[PDB]
Amino acid sequence: SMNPPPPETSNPNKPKRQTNQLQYLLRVVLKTLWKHQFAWPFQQPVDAVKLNLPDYYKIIKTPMDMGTIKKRLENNYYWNAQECIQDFNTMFTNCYIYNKPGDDIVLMAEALEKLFLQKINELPT
Ligand SMILES: C[C@@H]1CN(S(C)(=O)=O)CCN1Cc1cc2c(=O)n(C)cc(-c3ccn(C)n3)c2o1
Numbered sequence: 154s155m156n157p158p159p160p161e162t163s164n165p166n167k168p169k170r171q172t173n174q175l176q177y178l179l180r181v182v183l184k185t186l187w188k189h190q191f192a193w194p195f196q197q198p199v200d201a202v203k204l205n206l207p208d209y210y211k212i213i214k215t216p217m218d219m220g221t222i223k224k225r226l227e228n229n230y231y232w233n234a235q236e237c238i239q240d241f242n243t244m245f246t247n248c249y250i251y252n253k254p255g256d257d258i259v260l261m262a263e264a265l266e267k268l269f270l271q272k273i274n275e276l277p278t
Pocket residue numbers: 193194195199204206247248251252256257258259
């Protein structure tokens with residue numbers, strides 16, 4: 154296989170702003186999820202070359218990962234918290250689309266998704 158370019162983390166055409174919710178999404182939500190023992194499959198874009206997954210980018214056409222999300226938050230890419238939350242959702246959904254119910258990686262995604270929802274419910278207004 155070959156890898157696609159990773160999702161953009163910079164774009165001068167895009168509106169963006171710093172909000173207190175986006176600051177919390179970096180400092181609390183992302184940085185805590187990152188430390189979970191099940192985070193490692195989700196800390197970078199899927200490297201289809203390294204992993205010998207020539208079908209990954211045939212199935213997943215909107216890739217997303219926490220490495221990309223981290224850089225988007227650090228680089229003030231987002232306009233609001235909802236944009237960032239949608240990237241987390243896309244990441245979890247992709248795992249379920251590409252893998253199978255009952256796979257270890259799916260169990261890992263499910264555990265992180267439940268953690269994420271609890272942390273989103275704890276978002277400041
Ligand atoms: C090897 C894994 C092993 N799993 S399993 C048996 O643990 O159930 C079945 C899928 N397979 C390929 C794969 C799918 C997939 C994925 O969706 N993400 C998000 C990340 C990885 C991965 C593998 C290693 N890294 C670093 N990331 C990843 O690898």
